[PDB]
Amino acid sequence: MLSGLNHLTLAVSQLAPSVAFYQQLLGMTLHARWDSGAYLSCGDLWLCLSLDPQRRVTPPEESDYTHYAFSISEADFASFAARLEAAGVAVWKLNRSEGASHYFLDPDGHKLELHVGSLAQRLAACREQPYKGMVFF
Amino acid sequence: MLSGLNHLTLAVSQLAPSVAFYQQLLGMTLHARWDSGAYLSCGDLWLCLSLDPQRRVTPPEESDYTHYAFSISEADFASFAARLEAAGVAVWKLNRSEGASHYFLDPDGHKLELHVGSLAQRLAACREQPYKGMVFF
Ligand SMILES: Cn1c(=O)oc2cc(N)ccc21
Ligand SMILES: [Mn+2]
Numbered sequence: 553m554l555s556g557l558n559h560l561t562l563a564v565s566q567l568a569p570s571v572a573f574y575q576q577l578l579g580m581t582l583h584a585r586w587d588s589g590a591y592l593s594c595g596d597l598w599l600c601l602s603l604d605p606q607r608r609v610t611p612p613e614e615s616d617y618t619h620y621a622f623s624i625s626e627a628d629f630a631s632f633a634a635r636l637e638a639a640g641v642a643v644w645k646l647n648r649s650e651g652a653s654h655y656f657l658d659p660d661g662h663k664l665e666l667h668v669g670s671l672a673q674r675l676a677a678c679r680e681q682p683y684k685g686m687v688f689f
Numbered sequence: 690m691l692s693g694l695n696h697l698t699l700a701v702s703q704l705a706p707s708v709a710f711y712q713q714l715l716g717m718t719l720h721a722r723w724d725s726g727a728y729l730s731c732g733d734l735w736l737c738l739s740l741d742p743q744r745r746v747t748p749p750e751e752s753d754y755t756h757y758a759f760s761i762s763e764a765d766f767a768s769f770a771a772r773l774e775a776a777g778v779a780v781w782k783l784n785r786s787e788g789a790s791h792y793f794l795d796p797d798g799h800k801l802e803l804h805v806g807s808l809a810q811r812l813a814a815c816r817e818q819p820y821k822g823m824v825f826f
């Protein structure tokens with residue numbers, strides 16, 4: 553039986569800017585680095601950056617909607633978004649759903665998000681206003 | 690301050706086989722399904738499957754090393770991997786470069802992994818058998 557997410561691995565084209573982004577800009581904890589990658593943590597999340605010459609710096613119009621959302625409190629959301637904006641981090645989508653969300657790109661174009669709110673919060677909102685075709689279990 | 694992964698969203702090309710894969714084959718908990726997506730959980734992980742006409746079925750030689758690993762116990766690992774094998778689930782990697790792992794593909798070619806062990810355990814193993822140039826913080 554699967555018990556959770558063990559780790560997220562992002563392929564990166566250049567290790568140093570990716571470490572700077574996740575550790576310094578985003579505040580994640582750097583535990584180890586080697587010639588071709590790094591291990592960081594963000595709360596329970598184990599993040600691996602893996603240096604990969606096959607990683608393309610990918611414009612957001614050229615990638616699908618796969619994305620990775622990090623938790624932040626409502627109280628901290630606006631100042632973290634402003635930090636990303638000060639650093640010139642590009643936004644790939646505006647929020648139109650429940651709960652605050654900021655949609656931003658990493659140096660290689662990985663699609664990231666800051667989100668406030670749990671699955672339980674989302675399901676409660678959907679119960680009251682279900683999406684088209686929505687069934688609950 | 691970022692506190693972990695809020696959710697993982699995978700773009701899918703065909704919703705029904707993707708729901709079946711994550712719910713029926715992998716055993717995750719299906720909470721809701723609508724015309725364009727589904728919400729599942731795997732332990733504390735919130736997984737969203739999002740129907741995306743941009744998603745392409747991607748062979749593993751065409752994608753980079755970005756991947757998503759799920760936790761499984763030492764007692765369950767081998768039989769779960771063998772069941773995926775017997776079910777014809779495609780693979781993408783054989784060499785265990787990061788411990789006890791099974792590397793497999795979802796219906797769209799998302800790179801998945803079963804892994805036994807925590808980040809702390811991987812750091813301890815790496816101290817004995819470090820990756821080239823490895824530094825520990
Ligand atoms: C089979 N099935 C299900 O369990 O929930 C559904 C929802 C939709 N929209 C379409 C099909 C299903
Ligand atoms: Mn999202």
Ligand SMILES: [Mn+2]
Pocket residue numbers: 559561756758787802
């Ligand atoms: Mn892995």
